[model samples]
Target: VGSLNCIVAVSQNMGIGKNGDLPWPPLRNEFRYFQRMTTTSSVEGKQNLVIMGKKTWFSIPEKNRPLKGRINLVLSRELKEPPQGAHFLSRSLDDALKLTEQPELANKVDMVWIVGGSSVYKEAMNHPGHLKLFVTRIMQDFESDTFFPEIDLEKYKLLPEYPGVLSDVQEEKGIKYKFEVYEKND
Candidate 1:
């Protein structure tokens, strides 16, 4: 894995979601930020890969099936075939990681991104490799049943947004959140 990253949003209470949907309104700027991070790759001619669970895959709007730009890898043991627009499918996180790291995909892939639905995040974090976290800090809270996994500062160092990602907080009304990155073993 060149640089496996997780892009997630969580409330102050660590609440990530409710009823398989977001607990709060969609932050448009944040969405753009996510798109840029997951789609951009360090390797000049390569693209990034996003690994998400079946639920997350389905949660996306039908019209936006493949989540354009980056390669969409869905994890699902229930289905033998990949979804219509999905580029890849696997039964487990490890299996999916193997596909991204395969030499055949070397030039085509530069980063592996974990786009989750609770369970996927828990399992992905268990891997021993260094993983960076692109955490969106939602400054508010809601009654969410799905919670994001805990972070250990000892294992990851928080860095100020780079490349002029100044003004971390989204200035839009009602969206009191900022983008943060925690680099593993930094």
Candidate 2:
């Protein structure tokens, strides 16, 4: 299987959200990067899987989900069924990842993307698998109620450049950011 991956945008202070929503104005290029990466598959005739927390699932606008071309798995401990637009529901990240290994899904899922809230980000960072952290580093700071976890440098190596990510600093609406990828070491 391919590496389990995480994609997130973070502010200078590592804040990911505010009041259950994005803390900064949405960047078109950044959003487009996510769309492109998550929708692309290494295996022909297959799609990628995006695993997000329950809060993350509802945070998306109604018309924009089940996030188009990816398999959407929402993690929830209380939800008994998949939410209206969600493809699947699970009680934990482990369960969600395991679900993708089932015969029906294993052949169809090319990669597992851990799109986040907070708890899942923390857990995914420590998951014992080949992992890649695809992060957008925002230059400005914002007031936030949620945050992405700190990277453990000893276990994860930040690459100087990655093949498909933009190398230049990207700016939109006065916000400047850059794309970065960190590989979890063996």
Candidate 3:
């Protein structure tokens, strides 16, 4: 199995949501959606793995605390206890990359989904390699305090979107969203 290197995130500011709620539900749903999409049986027995910042872990719902099946890697500057069912690694992005390169982890997983709060994604983007992105575009305008970083369009080539049904609740800022995948090139 080949490892899929990608980053996933949603926000309004660079770090506003560091210890707060994600501005959009579409963002949360996107994670579950991708989890289902990449783990389907047709892909053999390969599983998904997510690497996230410490704040991202706190943001996940308590009930969904430990995302099932997939490996959860939490990165933090200060070493602390990871919540139940998570594998904690105290490191900067450089350290995390070195760890991922270790034979034990680099060989098993087919993909590395860098799920984030803002800093983590920023770190991944600055890494010395190409990184793919799977972004969900939400239609409704949101007055968000947190925002995603401006991506370099020159680096990412968009692929066909994955279509899906629109959400039902209108007042909750009903949105018709689609997944847009981008691959990095030299």
Candidate 4:
């Protein structure tokens, strides 16, 4: 079985990034939550996969590249290699999914998380597969050049609650945010 998910932090305007970097100041708790969600796996010996666009990979600091404790799949048509610490290089979302189903990795991947920039997020949202969107909604607005695609209400349902996700709004560095989960209607 395969499960595809997306995780992101968006502002009131659905903005995610500005000038290739996060628009807001770093939120320590938010960072910890992202680490915990992507790193945890249900299967004893399996690991989750975090797929990201080329820019998202570079947006990460050099020392934190590839994000430890999970399989990092970087999607880039130009990059011939998997970047220094990435586990695999993919040309597209479909190619990355196929790689997960190959014999060697099929049984070892517990979940596929689409961690992205802009286009990649749209692709995963449009994919005809099971998808759970884990979003950290920033209540305040910030200047951003990049934006997350609008979630189609007809295609996704906002769940009342999701396990391992805090229901309470939290404040950090003067900003307030909350976690939300949306499941594809189909």
Candidate 4 residue-wise lDDT, 29-100, digit = tens: 999999999899878989999999988998999999879989999999999999888999999999999999
Residue 77, model 4: Cα distance from true site in angstroms: 1.5
- Runs with alpha carbons beyond 4 Å of true place in candidate 1: 42-44
> Please, what is the TM-score per model?
0.89, 0.96, 0.74, 0.96
lDDT of 1 by residue, 1-186 (tens): 645778898999999888878888777877888888788766787878889988888889999889887889999989998888999889998888777667867568777899897888877766676887888889988789889988876777888665635454675556688878777743
lDDT of 2 by residue, 14-123 (tens): 99999878999878878999999888976898889999998999899999989999999999999999999999998987888788888878788888899998899899
Clashing pairs in 3: 11-146, 11-147, 12-146, 12-147, 13-146, 13-147
Residue 12 displacement (Å), model 4: 0.8
lDDT of 3 at 44: 51
Task: Compare candidates 1 and 2 on TM-score and give the better one.
Answer: 2
- Candidate 4 segments exceeding 4 Å error: none
Per-candidate clash tally? 0, 0, 6, 0
What is the number of residue pairs that collide in model 2? 0
Q: Candidate 3: where are CA atoms >4 Å away?
A: 1-4, 7-19, 25-31, 37-46, 160-173
- Give the local distance difference test score of model 1: 0.81
